[PDB]
A and B are shown apart, each in its own frame.
With several copies, the nearest count.
Chain A
Amino acid sequence: ESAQQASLTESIPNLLTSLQNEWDAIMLENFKLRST
């Protein structure tokens, strides 16, 4: 055997808008990678 990520000022979106975009970008990329 520190990293800092500044959370956005408009942080509801972590449940709705951020979480859908993470599982969209996971889904579309790997399928495009199988196409690759």
Chain B
Amino acid sequence: LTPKELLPHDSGQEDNERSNIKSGKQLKSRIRKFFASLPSPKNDFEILSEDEKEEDAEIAEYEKEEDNFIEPPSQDAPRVSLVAVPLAYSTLKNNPQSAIDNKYNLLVANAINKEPHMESRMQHITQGRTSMKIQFKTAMPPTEVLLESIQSKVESIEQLQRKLQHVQPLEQQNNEMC
């Protein structure tokens, strides 16, 4: 028994296995793809599911870390969450049609709320005032960096365009005299 650079490869593989269990079992939504902290909105939404809404609001404030962070004693989850996902999948053509009909009703509800809008008006002009600050300063930088380079060659272009209107006017009186 003589190990050499094997316990270092085994400690690296054990550390690579432990990082794979921590990254997968951290959060389902945070790891996949894509909020402001608000304890007043969790207090206002108490009066909903009225038990699960407060469980999901405290879970959103804990994973994000007027904001206090308390419990990361929640997410060793990886074996208990696998049994919970397999038990819920067993309890869950007809189901595919009932999901497509409810998706069309939610799409019609999304098209009706947008149609009624087109308080909320003051936020859109302030987002435009942020855009008119950002884009037009980016426009004035891209214009003046261009106009230092293009207006020199615009004069190279436009004065050579003016040579064409005199070469055409000398061509017609010469063709008339020819």
- Say if the beta carbon of A7 comes within 8 Å of chain B: yes
Task: Indicate which residue in A7, A28, A35 contacts B161 across the interface (CB closer than 8 Å).
Answer: A7
Closest to B168 in A: A5
A27 to chain B minimum Cβ distance, whole angstroms, is 12
- Find B110's partner among A6, A7, A9, A36 (CB 8 Å cutoff): A36
A28 to B115, CA, bound (A): 11
Residues of B within 8 A of A6 (CB): 150, 157, 168
- Indicate with 1 or 0, residue by residue over B112-124, a CB within 8 angstroms of chain A CB atoms: 0010001000000
A35 to B157, CA, bound (A): 31
**Given the known A-B contacts A32-B114, A36-B110, A36-B114, are A9 and B142 also in contact in the complex, defined by CB atoms under 8 Å?**
yes
CA distance A35 to B111 in the complex (A): 11
Residue of B nearest to A5 (CB): B168
B98 to chain A, nearest CB (A): 24
Residue of A nearest to B124 (CB): A35
Q: Is the CB of A9 within 8 A of B168?
A: no
Q: In angstroms, how far is the closest chain B Cβ from the Cβ of A33?
A: 8
| Interface: B164 (CB within 8 A) | yes
CA distance A32 to B164 in the complex (A): 21
B33 to chain A, nearest CB (A): 12
Task: Report whether B142 and A32 are in contact in the complex, using a CB–CB cutoff of 8 Å.
Answer: no
Within 8 A of A (CB), among B88-105: none
- Residue B146, interface by CB 8 Å: yes
Q: Does B125 contact A (CB under 8 A)?
A: no
Q: Are A8 and B161 in contact (CB under 8 A)?
A: yes
Q: How far is the CA of A31 from the CA of B61 in the complex (A)?
A: 32
Check B143 against A10 for contact (C-beta < 8 Å).
Answer: yes
Is B147 interfacial (CB 8 A cutoff)? yes
Give the top 10 A-B pairs by smallest Cβ distance, nearest first: A9-B146, A9-B143, A5-B168, A36-B114, A8-B161, A32-B114, A32-B118, A9-B147, A36-B110, A9-B150
Q: 8 new A-B pairs (CB below 8 Å) besides A9-B150, A10-B143?
A: A5-B172, A6-B157, A6-B168, A8-B161, A9-B143, A28-B118, A32-B114, A32-B118
